[PDB]
């Protein structure tokens, strides 16, 4: 929960060979870190179980799906539309089952051909419109991207300007600190003159007793 622990990155370029040095320092930082988890998700919020305790439906759905063992495709063998086999031929209730499947697939294909004829008769401009709408979503999305890119770039530029307005003042403050250092060395030679002046005074008392 640190506040803006930052050194400006557009001013303060990280050197080439300082990547290995700063890397080793961060590594030893890690070595004796206080509570080294690398599973620190414990403090992260609890990522909860998939909430369908009121639909067994999705319950069993997930219990299988994580194992990825797929559902079989739907009833392909019945789809081949076959009448009762050898051990099912003689019994007529099996031919009732055959009535079910044969009649069902008959009207299957009938309303199928109806839908296909209905679109190839009608659907053309409907597909025209929906592909137009897919292109509309396309271009609107890239427009959002250009916008976000633009605003973010402007913010970044502002940040760079702010960085420049600071790094110059920081640099000059530090160089005048170095001049303050040489000024201190000046006052060091002043302390030299302190010693020299006292040594000079070490003659007046001499003459005074003389």
């Amino acid at each position: 929960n640190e506040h803006l622990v930052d050194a400006l990155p557009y001013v303060d370029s990280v050197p080439p060979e300082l990547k290995p040095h700063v890397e080793a320092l961060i590594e030893e930082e890690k070595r004796r870190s206080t509570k080294l988890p690398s599973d620190y998700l414990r403090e992260m919020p609890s990522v909860r179980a998939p909430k369908f305790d009121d639909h067994p439906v999705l319950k069993t759905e997930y219990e299988r799906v994580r194992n990825k063992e797929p559902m079989a495709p739907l009833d392909s063998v019945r789809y081949r539309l076959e009448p009762p086999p050898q051990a099912r031929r003689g019994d007529v209730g099996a031919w009732k089952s055959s009535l079910d499947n044969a009649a069902a697939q008959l009207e299957h294909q009938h309303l199928r051909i109806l839908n296909q004829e209905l679109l190839l008769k009608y659907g053309d401009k409907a597909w025209r419109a929906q592909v137009a709408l897919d292109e509309a979503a396309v271009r609107g999305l890239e427009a959002q991207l250009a916008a976000l890119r633009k605003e973010t770039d402007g913010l970044n530029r502002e940040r760079k300007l702010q960085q420049h307005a600071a790094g110059s003042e920081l640099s000059k403050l530090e160089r005048q600190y170095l001049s303050q250092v040489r000024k201190n060395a000046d006052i060091e030679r002043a302390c030299d003159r302190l010693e020299d002046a006292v040594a000079a005074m070490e003659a007046e008392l001499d003459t005074h007793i003389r």
């Binding site: 870190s33 206080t34 080294l36 620190y40 403090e43 998939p50 495709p73 659907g123 709408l133």
Partner: protein, 131 residues
Amino acid sequence: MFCSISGTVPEQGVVSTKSGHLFEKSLIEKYVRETGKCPVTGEPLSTEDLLPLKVNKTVKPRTAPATSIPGLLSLFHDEWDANMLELHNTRTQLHQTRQELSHALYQHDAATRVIARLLKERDEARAALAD
């Protein structure tokens, strides 16, 4: 065009008045009563605030094999297959992304400690040079 929560074009299009977010009707009613809030942010919302944006969506175009009761239900099948085939992968992506975030946080903490230490180093270095 899509309900933010849904992701595909709503067939009962509804925006809430208070929000600026267009929603699935049944879904967002369930959600407003399911937490009491606006699921885009957490804002407090009520079920009537929903606005029935209805301009008659009826454009969803029958595809070639999908134009069939056998086809529509077979694609129903692989559709639900794919819906869960995405959700579970998002569950595990959450887990690994979350783990990565935790690792990053620990690394950041280590970096803060090192910066705190190295700062004491530099501050005492300069105070020493001042002598």
